[PDB]
Design a protein around this nucleic acid. Structure first.
Length: 99
DNA sequence: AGGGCGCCTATAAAAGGGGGTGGGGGCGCGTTCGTCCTCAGTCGCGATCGAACACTCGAGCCGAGCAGACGTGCCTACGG
């Protein structure tokens, strides 16, 4: 082996889960066709059932603003002053070897 | 040239010194042994240095609670 496998609940392992969540959130904004871009909490929780919503609230507070709507299905609208990172910048965040 | 004479052989004893020869003792020298010194190596003791562990502080993360906002249902008051 040439690449190090982390231990359970290590600092490297916990950083990887956070960054992979940050990668997946960003690509959901790139998939959204609405102007301004918007995503749902339900789509992240369906892909990440082992995360609490509060841990997802940490990754969404810096890049998105919560707009509540009169239905049990609400949107995270991308901040107008937040520049969404480009594709190759997302590529540098998490490599296939780290996964 | 040859008879008689001188000398050799043998026997005792002494006396004294001199010379010759063999053995022993004494002296001087060299050799051998013992002791001491020096060098090397090893072990023991002390001191110093490095490593490992434990304690403390701080930072980060997660959970829970409360507040705000909107839906929905119910009750009341207002308007037709």
């Amino acid at each position: 082996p040439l690449f190090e496998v982390p231990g359970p609940n290590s600092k490297r392992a916990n950083t990887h889960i956070r960054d992979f969540l940050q990668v997946f959130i960003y690509r959901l904004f790139w998939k959204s066709k609405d102007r301004p871009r918007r995503i749902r909490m339900e789509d992240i929780k369906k892909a990440f059932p082992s995360h609490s919503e509060s841990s997802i609230r940490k990754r969404l507070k810096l890049c998105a603003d919560f707009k509540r709507t009169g239905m049990d299905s609400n949107w995270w609208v991308l901040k107008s002053d937040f520049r969404l990172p480009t594709e190759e910048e997302i590529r540098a965040m998490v490599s296939p070897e780290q996964c």
